[PDB]
Ligand binder design. Sequence first.
Ligand SMILES: Nc1ncnc2c1ncn2[C@@H]1O[C@H](CO)[C@@H](O)[C@H]1O
Ligand SMILES: Nc1ncnc2c1ncn2[C@@H]1O[C@H](CO)[C@@H](O)[C@H]1O
Ligand SMILES: [K+]
Lengths: 260, 260
Amino acid sequence: MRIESPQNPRVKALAALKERKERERTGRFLVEGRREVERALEAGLSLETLLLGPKARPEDRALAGGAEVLELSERALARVSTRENPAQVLGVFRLPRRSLAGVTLGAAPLVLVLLGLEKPGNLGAILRAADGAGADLVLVAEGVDLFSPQVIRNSTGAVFALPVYPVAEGEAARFLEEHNLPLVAATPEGERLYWEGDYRGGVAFLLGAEDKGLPEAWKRRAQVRVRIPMRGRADSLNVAVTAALLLYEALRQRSGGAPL
Amino acid sequence: MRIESPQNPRVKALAALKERKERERTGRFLVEGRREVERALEAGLSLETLLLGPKARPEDRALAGGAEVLELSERALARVSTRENPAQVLGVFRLPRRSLAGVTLGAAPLVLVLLGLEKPGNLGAILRAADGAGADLVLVAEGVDLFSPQVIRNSTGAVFALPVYPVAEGEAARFLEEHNLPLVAATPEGERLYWEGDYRGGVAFLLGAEDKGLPEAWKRRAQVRVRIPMRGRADSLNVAVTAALLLYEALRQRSGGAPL
Ligand SMILES: Nc1ncnc2c1ncn2[C@@H]1O[C@H](CO)[C@@H](O)[C@H]1O
Ligand SMILES: Nc1ncnc2c1ncn2[C@@H]1O[C@H](CO)[C@@H](O)[C@H]1O
Ligand SMILES: [K+]
């Protein structure tokens, strides 16, 4: 069917999914954007309803795969959207439960441990970097929301295929301990250059969120603390840039590059 | 003195510096943030007026160094600021006159050439990365505004110390030919991995602005085209992340690292 009024109860229900509490209550979440919807589908998430705006393309209908297709008016679409200018393709997906239970890591795994709550902008950028480098696992803080409109948007949907899990620090520590993997703490005060670390057999990088920084306890127990060199006026890099540099250095060594 | 009303004439004039048009007309620009003001001062920029918010520190007054010190109400500060949460220290500086003609590079220069008009946010982030890697020079497009609040904030004020020059394509080409810089074009389809380039003897990286492509004339000219591996879903990284990866790879090789 097609819904005209932004006051229609279905539209109100869809708009309510902007809130985390409503996503948890309903077990549903909204994915906005043609690209983001394709990414969620590819990742194996279950589509319940496809939403199409007035400027949707005929190809967008093929994304439904049997799900309900709901057409929205311009005004109805604007109510449901979290964007300045709404995407013309959106999907209502089942909110999956994520858990490290039984998760196994491949050989010489590249792991990023992001300590502390992170802002959605940074978080999206970090996930994109992890996606690019082919990280085997990303651990984030226990309360991190990976299904918010902002994280989905800022990661361009990279969040969906990535092995990323919100976990308490205690659980994370115990999980990492089970593997023969070095803990490498990133910090501008690190004693070694990050190029000097040996990541050829895998690595779990420890990286603090932007405003929290690396917790002293994690810095202490790391096998090595590494810095990215700063050669100008700035005392530190953005957290996502830091994450990319670390992951791509591990990738360089996996690709045959020698530690410095 | 202390100014209370956001409608005070001084406040309106200060708030008017939010437009490039008014900055050019007055030869003045606003630098917001204690850190950014200090770094502007370090760079030798001339401070005309120090602005102090109600919650400024007594230690902030020392920044004035002979300049007029104007105190603002929370109300008045909010109108001058470009932030939701205004910094309590701001500075009105004189616009400097900068020319590429008076620039000489080191023995094995690290140069970034950013082609096309770039969003102010991305630009500041690129400059922060360039400063960290210790780039000798960054060339940007002719119309690029380096004194916008966004470039200042996202560079954490590193824009002030970093050698950055807005130049037309002809002037950039002239500079590069004259300094005999090897041109390496960064593109996702590059024939070589960016680790496979030899940057030990200096390099100018050619990088297209976000969403903008890399001009075929520049791409063709380059000695080599290199890509950053993308092992996940996405096909490209954010421009500031790309810039950081390229520049720090060059720095790795300068620091004793060999090409892949
Ligand atoms: N040059 C650097 N070396 C190592 N870690 C860094 C560097 N710059 C920023 N970080 C890290 O990035 C995050 C953002 O401040 C923090 O966890 C911080 O420790
Ligand atoms: N994987 C990559 N390799 C080389 N350049 C890239 C890569 N990803 C993005 N870029 C560049 O970064 C900018 C942002 O799209 C463009 O100049 C683009 O060419
Ligand atoms: K529920």
